[PDB]
Amino acid sequence: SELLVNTKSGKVMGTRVPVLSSHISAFLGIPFAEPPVGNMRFRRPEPKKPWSGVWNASTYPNNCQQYVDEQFPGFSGSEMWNPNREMSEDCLYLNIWVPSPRPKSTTVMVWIYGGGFYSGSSTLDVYNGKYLAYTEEVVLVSLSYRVGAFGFLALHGSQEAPGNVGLLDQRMALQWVHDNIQFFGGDPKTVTIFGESAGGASVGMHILSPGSRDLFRRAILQSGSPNCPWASVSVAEGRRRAVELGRNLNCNLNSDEELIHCLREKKPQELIDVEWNVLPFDSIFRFSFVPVIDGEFFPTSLESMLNSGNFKKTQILLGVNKDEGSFFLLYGAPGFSKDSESKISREDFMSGVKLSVPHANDLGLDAVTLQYTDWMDDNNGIKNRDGLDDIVGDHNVICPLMHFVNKYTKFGNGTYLYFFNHRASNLVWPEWMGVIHGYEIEFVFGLPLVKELNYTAEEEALSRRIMHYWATFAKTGNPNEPHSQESKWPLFTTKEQKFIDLNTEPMKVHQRLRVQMCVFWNQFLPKLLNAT
Amino acid sequence: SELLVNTKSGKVMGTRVPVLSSHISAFLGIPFAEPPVGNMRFRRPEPKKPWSGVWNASTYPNNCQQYVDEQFPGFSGSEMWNPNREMSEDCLYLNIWVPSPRPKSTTVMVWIYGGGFYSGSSTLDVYNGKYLAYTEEVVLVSLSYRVGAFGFLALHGSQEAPGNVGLLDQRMALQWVHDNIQFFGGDPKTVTIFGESAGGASVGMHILSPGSRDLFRRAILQSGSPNCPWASVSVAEGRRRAVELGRNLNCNLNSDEELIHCLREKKPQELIDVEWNVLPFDSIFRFSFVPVIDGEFFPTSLESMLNSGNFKKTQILLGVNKDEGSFFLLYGAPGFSKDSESKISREDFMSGVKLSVPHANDLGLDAVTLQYTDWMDDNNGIKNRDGLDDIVGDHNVICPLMHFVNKYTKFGNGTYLYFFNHRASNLVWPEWMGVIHGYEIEFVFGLPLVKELNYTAEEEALSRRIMHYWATFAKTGNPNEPHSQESKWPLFTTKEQKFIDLNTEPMKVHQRLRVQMCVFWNQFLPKLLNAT
Ligand SMILES: *[C@@H]1O[C@H](CO)[C@@H](O)[C@H](O)[C@H]1NC(C)=O
């Protein structure tokens, strides 16, 4: 039967799912690791023991334990990102969408969800891989990984809570795909990993980590890069936060053994309730438990690895959205509200700047303020609001990604860069937020092709174009159709640094994406902070 | 006789001079101090002893000893600024242009020439006061003062070479005008002092110095302010330079007495030949002997005086030219030439930046470079050239003046600000230099009214308009004609910060002159240099 597949770990039975007046096969909730529960909490993952009989892969699995956003109860704009299945530490499963009839050896794409390393689910409606798998005829896989303390609590030196286990969860899933996707009709030698935000940073981390490089062919990074300021911490800071978490739960702190034992006896929600109390600074776009530069998963500092070319050399396709920072300002900066235009006063602008660059001294804060202030009209509420939006997006997403693309392109085999700037016609978030962090995902997954979702005809066309770019890149290492008559997405080169916009208007090629601001964030500010 | 005037110092006989098909009286070369020669070199000036008989004031006096520019021999653009009379240490004289018939008690304007405190003459063709005196019916006076080491060598603590004597020369001339102008038909209670560059800085210094305030009514500052970075030095730096001058002339340096005695035995040209060897840094727009913050002429630091309102409160009219920095880049920055378009390479841009801000550390240099570089087109020769031009003009003239105007306006009785941006149709300097430092002077003195000079009809109109603004301001404290139908020059206020452009086009009012760059130069950079 087309729904029965025998893998190296055992047999699995999928389910036939409808999609755009047709059907395809789906294998949901396939286990790739042993449940990281009890004594296994915080530990590196262990491969799933093979099973006898048939694994029922007809329904989505549980989501990993995580902080749940209740800032806007009932609001679809925020709830669409929350777990839609019951949460459990028993959450290491993957999902596969297979074209029908089953292919023999076709292109494989593996999705890695984002969520700042503190949240995320492979089961969100927005991550339904049936549209992409059906439309582009690729085998689509979505994996899962532990987030928050469960996946990133780090007490370097200890083997019980070494840190980065969430990244190892991802690697184990990639290993499973490498070893078994052939039975689902996928080509293990043509696997593209792609992800957004923390998922994009994760993709870059697998490009960097020697232990992950051999498991995939190409990569796509959406609004995220491994060198982002929020994406990793030092071993010392990771330890400090782990200890502070224990301090928040009245744990014995005399030794790592004592601390970990205490943390392992706590219910999942107990850790989550105090998770945010361990941050250094009053800040936005900063998360408690993230990857740690350990000298193992990451041999040396990310910068030294990027500079020496110590990473997988292949083709990459990546990009950012126009207003990456709006989400974070709305949730934590004074003056911003969901139901108002959020015009910002000069004073709230100052407060926002300090929250946005928590590690900077006063001189550093002055430099940022000067760089983003129009002194001919400094009390303009719209300008201050948009200025802060740019500060957050440039510092946390765009400039780190531009630093990554330029360093990578020197050693890589082909780079394609995009700037997504289309605001969906059916967005429920206010207009001031613009082209929001994460809202290009629905286009990548083809939701606009579903009539009931209320997208325009132009948006369906944009989605089809984007899905074809992504899948063609996954298949050939080039988003462009060999010998087509459509406008070509030029290769990003060290010299020309070209990129294209992604919207419903005719393709336009540009150069040096936000170069002025990124020279500030990537070269000047770091120098200022290190000298003063 | 109309040409004979009896002053408190003795009788003087002037000469009738033709002017625009008419005539007026001129009294040239009137002594206001005893020749500062021999034992008097470097000493404060002494009032001229009254004389018997009639002083022959029919010809221009000698010019003070100074460095003479020979960079472009025979070239009118540069030679028009050089001394046009024989040089001598016996140079403290003033010139007066009086309307005919002699007025009874009319508005008086006293011109103070510029020249970076190292040069200047009251006798330049461009400073001929007959046009202004005749056209606006004012008594026009031009004074002189010692420049270079002769007027500013400073060995604080010593009464033989205390420093600032050139400024005291200016004060003595103002005192003479206060005491005697009434005999020439001028009103000593309605005297306006005006000057350009070092002369403008000098005007601001008299506004600040308690000992000079009572000698004039209003002031006009053209392309210069007392707080300019090149306009003064500390007592320590002044001493260091005085000692280095002695070291350059093989002087005994065991004591001030030894040093001064040695310097007094040297011929004037001997001092001038080594004058430029005492600067701290490799730099442009920096001069060796300038005013010193002594605690006498200047009670405290200029900044503390400006902040506390420790200065004469009256009305002021001031402004700058569009391209103040071009002259200095042409003479000392690599890549600039008089006969080429001077497109600057990225490398020469860097060299230029270091020469322009000699006191800045590397981080400071990086900040300037970032602020003036278009990173989307960094190798554009025109942009690099114009960027450097702006750096020099903003740092040395515009921003210091804007800091002055804003601090002054808080306590003053009326401020009028202008931005001169008309390039003369008959300029002999290359086009890349734009609206050059000092080229608004010919309009203020009415040269465009002289047909033989080859100016256009529009330029004659601009000159007449400017002369009337200046003279009306001198007479009433307001450049505008009471109840006229012409466009009004608005008052510059702390809140609106309005100013007008001065060109042949219809008047346009603007606000916050180069505010973006001046926040950088006046607030950010100083903070960066002091913290790092
Ligand atoms: C497990 O598979 C069976 C079919 O064998 C079916 O009941 C369903 O798809 C799964 N069970 C649940 C939880 O509904």
Ligand SMILES: *[C@@H]1O[C@H](CO)[C@@H](O)[C@H](O)[C@H]1NC(C)=O
């Ligand atoms: C990628 O690598 C292949 C084989 O080494 C080479 O022929 C090709 O030019 C490379 N492409 C780029 C854009 O570097």
Ligand SMILES: *[C@@H]1O[C@H](CO)[C@@H](O)[C@H](O)[C@H]1NC(C)=O
């Ligand atoms: C001095 O005045 C006399 C007239 O009394 C006349 O010769 C001339 O104006 C002056 N002398 C010189 C130096 O020409």
Ligand SMILES: *[C@@H]1O[C@H](CO)[C@@H](O)[C@H](O)[C@H]1NC(C)=O
């Ligand atoms: C100048 O001073 C006079 C008298 O003190 C005052 O009436 C006038 O308002 C002042 N003007 C300005 C612009 O400050």
